[PDB]
Amino acid sequence: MMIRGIRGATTVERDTEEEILQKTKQLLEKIIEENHTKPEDVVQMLLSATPDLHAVFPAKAVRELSGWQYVPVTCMQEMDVTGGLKKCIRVMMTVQTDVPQEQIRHVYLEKAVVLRP
Amino acid sequence: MMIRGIRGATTVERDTEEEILQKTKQLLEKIIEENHTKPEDVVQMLLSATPDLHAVFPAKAVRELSGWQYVPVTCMQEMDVTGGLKKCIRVMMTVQTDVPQEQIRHVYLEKAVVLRP
Amino acid sequence: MMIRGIRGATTVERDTEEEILQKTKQLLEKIIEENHTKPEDVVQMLLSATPDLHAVFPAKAVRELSGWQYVPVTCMQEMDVTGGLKKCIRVMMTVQTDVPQEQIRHVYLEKAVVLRP
Ligand SMILES: O=C(O)C(=O)C[C@]1(C(=O)O)C=C[C@@H](O)C=C1
Ligand SMILES: O=C(O)C(=O)C[C@]1(C(=O)O)C=C[C@@H](O)C=C1
C-alpha cells in the first residue's frame, strides 16, 4: 500500500506567531485542496523553518485544521544556506495515496514560488 | 496494515552524554511498550534535539535496545522557538501497524508532559 | 508492500557548491546501485548537513539524477555534537521494498566510513 511525500513551501513577512500560523495554515489547506488529502491517510508530517523564524512552531497551525488532531507532526530547523530564501516554512507531508509520483501536487506559495521547478 | 508515525518527547536537566542517553532510552522503551513495537516493523526513526544539547547524538541510545541494530535512524536540530521547552529531545518513529491513527500511543515524559494534547 | 529507510552518509573537504553537489551525487548513486532503487518506488528523501556547511542545499544534487525529478526531498540541519564528524551530509531515503531490514544496503563514504557499525 503505497506511501508518497507531498512537499509545500511558503514564506512569511515577519517573525510573529500570527503570521507564521496564518501562512502555515494557508499552505496546508492548499496542499489538502490540491491532493484531496484526508487526515487519517497521513502517516506523519515534518515542518521546517529557516533559522530566522522563532515566534512559534508552525505545527501549532495543524490544530486549526478540524479532524487533524491525531496526525503526528514534528518541526526541524532548515539548513542555513548562503543566499537561500529567507523566512521560509516548508512541509513534507507523508501520505497513503495511489496517485502516481508525477501527479502529486506539490505546493509553492508566496515568495517560495521561486522554488518551483 | 498501514504506515503510521509515533511521537515521543522528553527532557534532560543537563547536557551530558549520560543523561541524554538515559532519557532517550527511557523514552524509546516507553514507546515500544505502549505500542508493542517490533524493530522489524520500524520503517525508520528521526530523533531531534533543541540547539542547547551537544554532548551526544540521541540516536546512540538505540544501540542499547536489543535487536534494533538494523533500524535506520538519523538526527536533526529542532527549530529554536522563543519561550519553547529547553533541552528537549523528540522522536518520530515510523512503523507498520494495524492500529488506527487515533489509537496510536504517543509518549511524553519529564518536562515534555506539557506538550500532551 | 513494506516501506524501509535507507541511510547514507558522506563528507566534503570544504564548504563549496562543487564539493557538496559532487559528493552528494556520488552518495546517492551508490545507494541506488547497491539497492537497485527505482525513483517511482521512493516515498521521499531527507538530507541533512552539519552546521559548518552553507554553500548550497545538497538536494540540488538530486536534479542531476535522470528520472528523479519527481522524488520529493527536503533538507534539514544536523545537530552540532561535540567531537561529532565535521562537514557531514546524511541521507534518509524512504523506499517501498520487500528486502528484509537486515539486508538493506546502507552506504557510508569518504570520512563518514567511521559512522558505519
Ligand atoms: O509534540 C511535540 O513534541 C511538540 O512540542 C508540539 C509540536 C506541535 O505544535 O505540534 C511543536 C514542535 C515539535 O517539533 C512537534 C510538534
Ligand atoms: O550513521 C550516521 O549517520 C551517524 O552519524 C550515526 C548516528 C547514530 O548515532 O546512529 C548519529 C547521528 C546521525 O544523525 C544519524 C545516526
Which domain CATH number covers C14? 3.30.1330.40
In C, which residues are within 8 Å of A79 by CB distance? 48-49, 53-54, 57, 75-77
Backbone angles phi, psi at C44, to 5 degrees: -175, 170
C-alpha pair distances (Å), B14 with each of A79, B20, B80, B110: 26, 8, 18, 13
- The closest of B5, B66, B74 to B38, measured between CA atoms, is B66
In A, which residues are within 8 Å of C96 by CB distance? 2-3
**Under DSSP, is residue A26 helix (H, G, I), strand (E, B) or coil?**
helix
| Residue-wise burial string across A107-116, b where 16 or more C-beta atoms lie within 10 A, e elsewhere | bbbbbbeebe
Please give the full DSSP string across B24-44, using - where no structure is assigned: HHHHHHHHHHHHT--GGGEEE
Number of DSSP helices (H) and strands (E) in chain B, helices first: 1, 5
Backbone angles phi, psi at C111, to 5 degrees: -75, -10
Helices (H), B12-114: 17-35
Q: Whole-angstrom Cα distance, residue C73 to residue A117?
A: 12
Answer yes or no: are the C-beta atoms of C96 and C3 closer than 8 Å. yes
Q: Nine-digit cell at B22? A: 538515559
Strands (DSSP E) along chain C, which ranges? 3-11, 42-49, 73-77, 88-96, 107-108
- The closest of C27, C22, C25 to C10, measured between CA atoms, is C27
Q: Nine-digit cell at A19? A: 503570521
Q: Whole-angstrom Cα distance, residue B99 to residue A7?
A: 26
Min Cα separation A113/chain B (Å): 23
**CA-proximal residue: ligand 1, atom 13 (nearest):** A74
Answer yes or no: are the C-beta atoms of A10 and A25 closer than 8 Å. no
**Count of CB atoms situated within 10 Å of the CB of A41:** 16
Furthest-apart CA pair in chain C: how many Å? 41
* Residue B7 annotated as lining a ligand binding site: yes
Answer yes or no: are the C-beta atoms of B95 and B67 closer than 8 Å. no
Q: Whole-angstrom Cα distance, residue A109 to residue A22?
A: 12
Compute CA A49 distance to the chain's CA centroid, rounded to the nearest angstrom: 10
Place of cell 538519523: B74
How, if at all, do strands C3-11 and C107-108 pair?
parallel
Residues near B82 by beta carbon (within 8 Å), at least 6 away in sequence: A54, A55
Q: Whole-angstrom Cα distance, residue A62 to residue A21?
A: 9
Burial of residue C62 (CB within 10 Å: 0-12, 13-18, 19+) is buried
Give residue A59 CA to ligand 1 midpoint distance, Å: 6
Structural domain range at position A96:
1-117
- The closest of A69, A84, A65, A78 to A7, measured between CA atoms, is A78
CB contacts < 8 A (A, C): 69
Residues near A75 by beta carbon (within 8 Å), at least 6 away in sequence: A46, A47, A48, A49, A57, A58, A59, B78, B79
Q: How was this structure obtained? A: X-ray
- The closest of A6, A32, A1 to A98, measured between CA atoms, is A1
Min Cα separation A116/chain B (Å): 24
| Residue-wise burial string across B86-111, b where 16 or more C-beta atoms lie within 10 A, e elsewhere | ebbbbbbbbbbbeeebeebebbbbbb
The residue count of chain C comes to 117
C-alpha pair distances (Å), C25 with each of A11, C40, C59, C65, C90: 28, 18, 9, 8, 12
Annotation says A116 is catalytic: yes
- Nearest ligand 1 atom, CA B9: 3
Q: Whole-angstrom Cα distance, residue B30 to residue B65?
A: 12
Please give the tally of structural domains in chain C: 1
Answer yes or no: are the C-beta atoms of C74 and A115 closer than 8 Å. no
User: Given in angstroms, what resolution was this structure solved at?
Assistant: 1.7
